[PDB]
Design a protein around this ligand. Sequence first.
Ligand code: FAD
Ligand code: MG
Ligand code: MG
Ligand code: MG
Ligand code: MG
Ligand code: NA
Ligand code: NA
Ligand code: NA
Ligand code: NA
Ligand code: NA
Ligand code: NA
Ligand code: NA
Ligand code: NA
Ligand code: NA
Ligand code: NA
Ligand code: NA
Ligand code: NA
Ligand code: NA
Ligand code: NA
Ligand code: NA
Ligand code: NA
Ligand code: NA
Ligand code: NA
Ligand code: NA
Ligand code: NA
Ligand code: NA
Ligand code: NA
Ligand code: NA
Ligand code: NA
Length: 256
Amino acid sequence: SPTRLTYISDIIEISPYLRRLVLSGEQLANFPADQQGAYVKVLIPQPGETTVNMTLTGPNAAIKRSYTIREFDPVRGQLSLDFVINKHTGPATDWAKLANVGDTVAIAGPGPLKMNRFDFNDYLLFGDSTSINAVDALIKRLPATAKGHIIMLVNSHQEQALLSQHPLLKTHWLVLNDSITAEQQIDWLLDKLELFGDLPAVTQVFVGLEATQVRVIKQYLLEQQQLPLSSISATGYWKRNTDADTFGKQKQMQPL
Ligand SMILES: Cc1cc2nc3c(=O)[nH]c(=O)nc-3n(C[C@H](O)[C@H](O)[C@H](O)COP(=O)(O)OP(=O)(O)OC[C@H]3O[C@@H](n4cnc5c(N)ncnc54)[C@H](O)[C@@H]3O)c2cc1C
Ligand SMILES: [Mg+2]
Ligand SMILES: [Mg+2]
Ligand SMILES: [Mg+2]
Ligand SMILES: [Mg+2]
Ligand code: NA
Ligand code: NA
Ligand code: NA
Ligand code: NA
Ligand code: NA
Ligand code: NA
Ligand code: NA
Ligand code: NA
Ligand code: NA
Ligand code: NA
Ligand code: NA
Ligand code: NA
Ligand code: NA
Ligand code: NA
Ligand code: NA
Ligand code: NA
Ligand code: NA
Ligand code: NA
Ligand code: NA
Ligand code: NA
Ligand code: NA
Ligand code: NA
Ligand code: NA
Ligand code: NA
């Protein structure tokens, strides 16, 4: 896929921890129209710089980070991405918090879609503010008859509106704050799992969460609920105390 030069045409705060950037430009005119919930790699300039180049490796290559397509309107040729802000420090979140309309942004991708099948009727969808737009994309493709649960960790009640309604899927939300420890988050996730009891054997599961959360949920599903591996689409979106490049190489060595 060709790297594309885009322009920020709008910025909107969605919550105190989530900033939507709307990208525009003639380079998006032929962007693929079927990739909601897929990710792109955003090139991030060095702090206090604005330019990036096409160098692949070494000290002059741009930092790259993965962000989910919230919306691509082909009539309008505009791409929306929702960046978590004010929860951590790193090149992309820092850059996103300070970005302005008219700034240019180079993007690559989209990357290969890793997502569940849309044709079943039993689902658990686990996500957080980093994966919420992948969860939304999946919900909007499921049959109206699909039963199950949506289980989300968000940084603000305001983020809940990002998920499509669905007639039957039941939502469960935990709004995070600094008093809720990593262990308590895992306890909450496992508490929800146990509350679902014996899962239908045909249940399909999406997980897009922090790396250890993914490990715990996946192991529970495989060993306690005995779901087939093929029924789980699990991705570690981020990992505590680990930058994206380090994390990427960890996942290459040992996939989740
Ligand atoms: C397919 C895919 C799609 C993604 N889509 C989105 C998206 O749409 N929106 C989004 O915000 N993120 C998304 N992410 C996650 C995003 O790529 C990471 O959060 C990334 O680490 C952010 O880059 P950074 O440069 O800000 O921080 P990094 O330099 O990668 O990390 C620096 C520090 O920040 C920690 N950290 C990173 N992210 C978080 C976080 N959200 N919360 C708390 N601590 C964090 C790290 O553990 C590390 O210690 C996606 C990831 C994947 C794999
Ligand atoms: Mg353009
Ligand atoms: Mg993030
Ligand atoms: Mg942040
Ligand atoms: Mg969709
Ligand atoms: Na909002
Ligand atoms: Na808003
Ligand atoms: Na957020
Ligand atoms: Na243009
Ligand atoms: Na993708
Ligand atoms: Na730069
Ligand atoms: Na560069
Ligand atoms: Na190149
Ligand atoms: Na070079
Ligand atoms: Na995604
Ligand atoms: Na997004
Ligand atoms: Na997001
Ligand atoms: Na920030
Ligand atoms: Na971010
Ligand atoms: Na599936
Ligand atoms: Na998202
Ligand atoms: Na649907
Ligand atoms: Na569909
Ligand atoms: Na609903
Ligand atoms: Na903890
Ligand atoms: Na999480
Ligand atoms: Na199993
Ligand atoms: Na299966
Ligand atoms: Na399957």
